């Protein structure tokens, strides 16, 4: 997974099928990826928010969550 | 050899007091007629081709959607509505729904939040069902006349004269060598109702078909026009998933080329020779004006009714007409006694012949093309018979 | 008796040097012409019928929806979205809304919950507005020729010869007894613009109409094709109610056959004889080729202009043409002097006669069918006059 | 002066044994032919006009929406759904959404409330794109015949005879003075494929165009029919704003007349003379029946191939045909030797002439109108040549 | 009104116009029908949930409610 | 701005561009107009509710609010 600062204030994570059930370090915090419908990067790619959940808050109905880092998004190709 | 060319009958022409001869010819596609004058060599007149060079693109349908750059935006139940830049952009499919929000997705109040998912909808390469409409006045009817010898591919036939006709273009003057200046007035007539006709073509086994206008316009697939960047009704191949906290997945409905081919089974195949969109049905009725010559007319006698056998049993031509081939054992040449009756009334002729003069010639002959009413019918070639069931008029299979 | 048959004029035929005679005939629907040769009996030639046997079903509209198996599914504001099996099924109408939920409907949190209602949408028996499209090349033009006696229903007329024609089929040879072999070349022409024509038929007072293509395709009713199980745009007759806690009622918009009949008032009625879809307007222009005979031609003199009276005043035929009947008190037989002028210019003839040769015969005659430009016009039958207002071109009533 | 009238050739007519003369004429729009008999004065026969008086209104599109009486209704999250009387009314656009509600907008519980905004959608004055469909059988083909002097506007031409024809009306008898009673049988043929033709007209620089059927029906604009009060698909010009507590603004997408005119650039302009909807392309092929006279026929010799120059270089006519004018320096009168070849094969004639007999007359002549296949072609007028590129068939610009 | 166990775990009540403002016994509990838009059984039939409301809870915006019995639905034809 | 009692129980205020950021007296209470997208009266007119907010309650996401007067609406033409 690659961590980058986009044209907007948002921090974008470009992940693949190998990055499923793994943790990536974003700035001063940590981001967890749990997306199962992942694959190799291509044109057919889905992009959404990785919710910045507070201290000890358990994630509800989400496959991407982050701690100590705000304004963070995840993108992945579905060609696998 | 083997020539289908039918000799000119006395009834087809009239010689005037001032020396003018008006020869009336009925030329179907492939059908040939031999016109001869006293002292002048025999000339074979025939309708070579009925086609339209690259007709207008009407509608192009997408069979397999190319989905790209999917973006999902979501906000808390107390916050404003979720917005995306793709919502007010062309060639994009967007869906607005309500997502369950709480502390697990970081929202102060438990309830329903605004969510929107957008995807750039386009078409996958070589996956288009393009349509073509014929312009009745733009269809070329090539009429060729040559003397009744074989010449190479690059070299041209000596005495061959070409004359093309349309609905608008009707009169031309040909310098037919020995015959001098002849006035050709050919009345154009299509064998296909062009108004209710669309040429469904797939990107390069059949890949082109002659489909009905009403069947084509009601295809449940995303469509656009020649020049347009975006696709209209793109949601026909886009299926949105259940709305989760901040995620809303987009599903492609897949390829529809297989679904189309199943509905296109039995549909008459379109004939495209490069850029020429050919029509295998139709005729041209000409009125030749000749001067300073005596026409040689040969009137036919009727063939022996008892001496007929099937060479090729009556079958579908592939353009709503019935084709058949007969073998004659008697004396040649003669005129084929051909008729047909609908099962019930054996006294009323229901045969509508495409072949103007079916004849058994010295060399060849014996090909009969005709139109028959729907239902059980009996075709008669003298004493020789055959039962044929003509299928009812249809626009195509269900989609 | 009473025969409308018009005797052949000298101008209509030409006798060649080689003995060939080319007789040109204009045969409208019902219109008869008498052709006679020196020594041979008189023959009546007429266009019997213009029809197409069972044309293709284009679109079938539902007038009264048959709603069945209505199911409503609902979930609490914190729970997931409500789903039904009928949502991803064919021939079903589904609506998604938000319902007010609390402790009164057993939900832990007060707010808005997901609700979905689905109904199986089909059509009620004998409540379909089926459409039919004519195939221009498939329309039969029956031409009959009999000698100028009455015979029973089961028995056939002695000397009667039947010859059917289309756009594709044009030339046939008839063995017309005493006249021998005659070459019939009949040019087919429809009196209705078939391209912009649809036959709206209801399930079995008029039950069939000749409607315009543009009016038919824009009918705000659920539609499908011949073979399809499900109905497209079924929501046109389905109205969903207000969303309650776990209930969402479905309302039928009712029967639309009465709404259709009101818009179909004044629309030309379609003529269906079993499976034969008849066209009451049209003609056939033939060129008869005769050999080894002398044709007997009788040229008409003009009728007395002052001796004309209306038998039946000019009225609408029911197929965009004007029909009229005249009574002549002078000497018979003669050619009717008929013309028409548009209110303003009394020197320019605006009459476009369907009847090729209107004549007062010894027995019958006096029927005149013609086309007139829209607006106030004055029809002249010699000295006899009548003002006629032709209505402007229309596609149909509003729906 | 300057008359284009072409003298009758010997090949065009036949004199019978019984004294009947059948003169065959090819009359294009504007094209004139001079028919002369021995001892009788010369008569000029020509096709004056091809038109249809006020054809049927198919679809009328709204270019600029007239929005009025906008009403917004909203309720608290616990209260029932917001309703408006305009929701179940005709000619109104309504949108249902969820608005954020709390104590700031006076609601007991914090959440999402029901909101609905309705606007009366109509069309702004003089902002309609009305469509017109031609009825093939209703199109008038005015044929006029006068002697070969100038007369005032109010006064009529002495010897002038008018005869109008359609597809249905084909035979009429004219009392052509010195020539007596002449039988005119004119076969009608349109130069435009009327089936795939719609006349797009704007409310009163071009304001009327001849557009394709498929291009017109797929216009992304609100539409209705002649007589209907309300507008179908009115949401095409209505854009709803973001839902606030009790307010939801409605935005007009603006005028689309400028967007339409850009797509209509290069599209053939429609010709409307008051109520007469003229077609600038087409012809009429007549068969004149004459009695008790000797016809004077003048056969043409071929023009000198080397003595040709361009008066007006080959250019687009404005109705899918090619127009050109030539200047001849040799001996007059003669028949123009005109042909054309597609770049590659210089032995096959691809020219499809609209002008039946192009001739250099004593006074005028030299106008040549023809149809050419798409691609690079070379037009030959004897030795004189010119390269022409015919554009491919198109339905119109993208919208 | 007829009480039956469907192909699913749900208990279905098939009622008519006569069953309006009446009480039907379903398993170990009781079900109350208040639907006014009822009629004779036919193809045109509406089916929905009969909310299992807790001890002493008053019904709000519902025409079918049940006590002590879970997973219960009501169906009725509208041909009367 | 003109105050009037409609065919319904609602009190309607017909205001123009001049009435922007002004206060109008309606019955026993007061109404405040804050709409910026106002103009001269014509056919193209927007009509909505002026929320009756309680004692000392601050207005949230609204351009028209009233005190001490219930059932009050605002209408204005957008031809300016």
Residue numbers in the entry:
A (entry chain D), E (entry chain D), F (entry chain D): 1 to 80
B (entry chain A), C (entry chain A), D (entry chain A): -1 to 146, 149 to 204, 209 to 403
Sentences from the paper on this structure:
The flavivirus envelope glycoproteins prM and E drive the assembly of icosahedral, spiky immature particles that bud across the membrane of the endoplasmic reticulum. The immature flavivirus particles that bud into the ER lumen display prM/E protomers in which the pr moiety binds at the domain II tip to cap the fusion loop, avoiding its insertion into the ER membrane. Maturation into infectious virions in the trans-Golgi network involves an acid-pH-driven rearrangement into smooth particles made of (prM/E)2 dimers exposing a furin site for prM cleavage into “pr” and “M”. The flavivirus particle’s life cycle includes three key steps: 1- budding into the neutral pH environment of the ER lumen; 2- transport across the trans-Golgi network (TGN), where the pH is mildly acidic and where the particles undergo a maturation step before exiting to the neutral pH extracellular environment;19,20 and 3- entry via receptor-mediated endocytosis into a target cell, where the mildly acidic endosomal pH triggers E-driven fusion of the viral envelope with the endosomal membrane. The fusogenic conformational change of E is irreversible, and the consecutive steps outlined above require a special particle maturation mechanism in order to avoid premature fusion-triggering in the acidic TGN during exocytosis.
